[PDB]
Design a protein around this ligand. Structure first.
Ligand code: CLA
Ligand code: CLA
Ligand code: CLA
Ligand code: CLA
Ligand code: CLA
Ligand SMILES: CCCCCCCCCCCCCCCC(=O)OC[C@H](COP(=O)(O)OC[C@@H](O)CO)OC(=O)CCCCCCCCCCCCCCC
Ligand SMILES: CCCCCCCS[C@@H]1O[C@H](CO)[C@@H](O)[C@H](O)[C@H]1O
Lengths: 57, 121
């Protein structure tokens, strides 16, 4: 069988499933962006742009 | 002029009576006579709250807030004596009325500030 480090090679000859895998990847990345923003908003203190700006937090 | 059923649910019941643009006259005070305020109404249109900076060296500002307790804010049906003093100044002395309203406003960022909006005594 395919060794573990080669499992994704089943997509080489399969354009449709490659698009599917790419779509899943894109979904994970956009989901991360959304999650990260929400986590940041849950933690961010907006009360002092002078001495406690975003980059200190 | 207007009845309860004309007014109910509109928001007008939280508003004070207004006067015409033409009402710019003068009401004479006779120092021989005693006076009263038969009705005093107060309708808040803005609630501002002073910012409390960590840097107690900057000049702190009063900032706009968002009202969350709806049209429940006005003081009304307030009465008391209107004394005429020696120097001809008038002194209103609040005696009774709907002279307080609990009010909650919200700062930018969501912090709620309850207050007893009042003119008691
Ligand atoms: C666009 C980027 C990209 C894409 C689409 C691919 C795609 C592919 N790679 Mg290449 N490769 C890349 C970049 C990429 N690679 C980089 C940056 C390196 C150096 C690190 C390599 C080094 C490399 C080697 C040595 C091999 C491949 C192989 C393969 C093929 C099979 C992969 C597989 O089944 O893994 C299966 C993987 C797993 C089951 C688990 C991997 C777990 C990793 C190590 C840790 C977790 C990572 C985490 C989940 C993702 C983090 C995201 C990150 C970008 C921030 C496939 C064509 C194989 C091949 O050529 O087959 C014939 C192969 O031997 N790649
Ligand atoms: C972008 C991510 C991505 C995508 C689109 C694919 C897509 C594909 N994979 Mg690959 N894989 C991935 C990442 C991905 N994989 C990673 C990170 C690993 C190492 C675990 C693998 C290991 C792997 C194997 C062994 C196989 C595939 C296979 C396949 C195919 C069928 C689906 C499958 O069997 O998945 C299996 C993989 C998973 C179900 C991913 C594991 C889920 C991990 C643990 C993340 C858990 C998410 C969770 C919600 C977060 C945890 C939070 C934590 C803080 C508690 C398809 C082409 C199959 C294939 O066709 O072989 C020929 C197959 O046998 N993958
Ligand atoms: C007018 C024709 C056209 C258009 C507009 C595109 C556009 C795109 N292609 Mg390409 N492609 C084309 C022709 C076209 N292609 C042809 C003729 C082939 C040979 C079959 C390919 C082969 C190909 C492959 C193998 C892949 C792409 C991928 C992509 C996407 C990469 C960027 C992305 O995912 O952003 C992020 C997405 C968005 C911001 C959302 C965009 C909104 C979409 C377009 C609306 C979806 C509804 C629509 C009616 C259905 C799909 C339309 C389709 C023509 C793209 C992008 C949407 C990649 C992809 O799909 O990755 C996920 C990919 O793997 N294309
Ligand atoms: C330009 C930006 C970019 C590029 C080129 C890639 C490219 C890739 N991504 Mg994606 N990713 C990105 C941004 C990007 N990512 C962002 C912003 C997020 C949100 C955080 C993700 C989330 C994400 C997930 C969840 C997964 C990928 C995976 C993949 C791989 C899929 C192809 C494959 O089979 O590789 C085969 C694998 C390799 C060639 C190994 C990659 C080696 C990386 C670069 C270093 C890993 C470091 C270390 C060993 C492990 C980390 C420690 C651990 C505790 C997490 C490929 C390397 C999938 C994957 O790796 O499947 C196996 C996968 O599951 N990505
Ligand atoms: C649908 C449209 C769309 C829009 C309007 C946005 C908007 C935004 N995103 Mg989101 N995102 C989207 C889709 C979108 N995204 C998709 C489909 C994914 C999954 C891949 C993501 C994943 C994502 C992540 C992980 C992040 C964002 C972030 C952001 C913000 C900053 C953008 C930035 O810095 O870009 C930077 C973009 C570039 C520098 C473009 C690079 C272009 C390269 C160089 C092109 C190279 C190839 C090209 C073909 C070369 C030829 C060019 C030719 C003209 C000559 C912004 C609010 C950030 C954020 O703030 O999250 C909350 C952030 O971290 N997005
Ligand atoms: C964010 C989500 C994250 C997802 C989690 C991802 C999980 C994937 C983890 C990958 C684990 C890979 C391990 C494969 C391990 C493995 O299968 O090895 C053996 C393997 C042999 O492959 P073959 O081609 O012979 O095929 C046999 C097949 O059955 C394998 O599938 O070779 C490799 O994979 C190359 C990598 C070398 C690695 C060898 C290092 C071992 C040395 C020991 C190091 C410690 C000693 C140090 C002392 C100083
Ligand atoms: C999917 C996004 C929906 C989540 C929206 C959350 C409301 S918005 C949220 O409100 C808080 C209190 O006012 C603020 O402290 C915080 O900065 C703000 O992000």
């Amino acid at each position: 069988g395919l060794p573990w480090y080669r499992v994704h090679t089943v997509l080489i000859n399969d354009p449709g499933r490659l698009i599917a895998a790419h779509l899943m990847h894109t979904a994970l990345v956009a989901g991360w962006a959304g999650s990260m923003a929400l986590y940041e908003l849950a933690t961010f203190d907006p009360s002092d742009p002078v001495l406690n700006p975003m980059w200190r937090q | 002029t207007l009845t309860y059923d004309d007014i109910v649910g509109t928001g007008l019941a939280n508003k004070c009576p207004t006067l015409d643009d033409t009402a710019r006259g003068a009401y004479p005070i006779d120092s021989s006579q005693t006076y009263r305020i038969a009705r005093l109404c107060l309708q808040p249109t803005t609630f501002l709250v002073k910012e409390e900076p960590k840097n107690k060296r900057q000049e702190a500002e009063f900032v706009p807030t968002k009202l969350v307790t709806r049209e429940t804010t006005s003081l009304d049906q307030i009465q008391g004596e209107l004394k005429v003093n020696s120097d001809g100044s008038l002194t209103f002395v609040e005696e009774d009325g709907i002279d307080f309203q609990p009010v909650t406003v919200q700062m930018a960022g969501g912090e709620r500030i309850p207050l007893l909006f009042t003119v008691k005594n």
